[PDB]
Structures are given as structure tokens and as C-alpha cells.
Amino acid sequence: SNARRLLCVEFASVASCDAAVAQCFLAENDWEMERALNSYFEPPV
């Protein structure tokens, strides 16, 4: 969808990451972008 492509572009821009990583963070978080970005930035421990 145009929506999911946009969400992926925006994620990849904020995260400065590649599109595959961005898209899979999105898909694995029910396509919820702010939630997915929180997951990206929460440090591993």
C-alpha cells in the first residue's frame, strides 16, 4: 500500500537504516511506526 511504503520510508529516514530492516521492524510491530521506532532505539541489554 502507499501507506506502508510511506511508513517504511519515514522509518528508514529517522532510523538511518536500510529499507529491509525498516520494513521488518514495521511488519513485526503490526505496521505501527512509532511503536516500531521505539523498538529500534531501545538499547539491547
Binding site: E10, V14, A15, S16, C17, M33, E34, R35, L37, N38, F41, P43
Partner: protein, 76 residues
Amino acid sequence: MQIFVKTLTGKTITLEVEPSDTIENVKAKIQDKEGIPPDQQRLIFAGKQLEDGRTLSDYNIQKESTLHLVLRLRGG
């Protein structure tokens, strides 16, 4: 100098800061102007989350830079 903080809702917050200001300082400024609690805020620049104790200079956040503001999603 002015920097810009862009939310994921497309809102641009303009802040007046010095390079030597800490990230904790910046989050407090955002709370002052917008009401967003610092503990909710993740500030991002160049694809990295900014740490409270570091400075704008530490990250080479120059004047007219844009930070991204990602909000933690709790409760509710």
C-alpha cells in the same frame, strides 16, 4: 541558535539553544514549550538516540539542524 525538533505527527518545534547545552536541557525546553514529559521523549539525530548527559556539540548538532522526536507509548 535555533534548532528544530520534528515530531512524527509532523509538528516542528523551534528551540533556542547553545551548542554546549545538554540533551537533558533540550528535553526540558521541549516540555516547557509543548508540555511533553522528558521521560516520554526519544530525541534522534543521524539515526542515533541522544543521551541525556551529552551535549549538542557532542553530536555535531549545528544550528538549524532537525532532531526527530519519537514518543514512548505507554499506558492508555
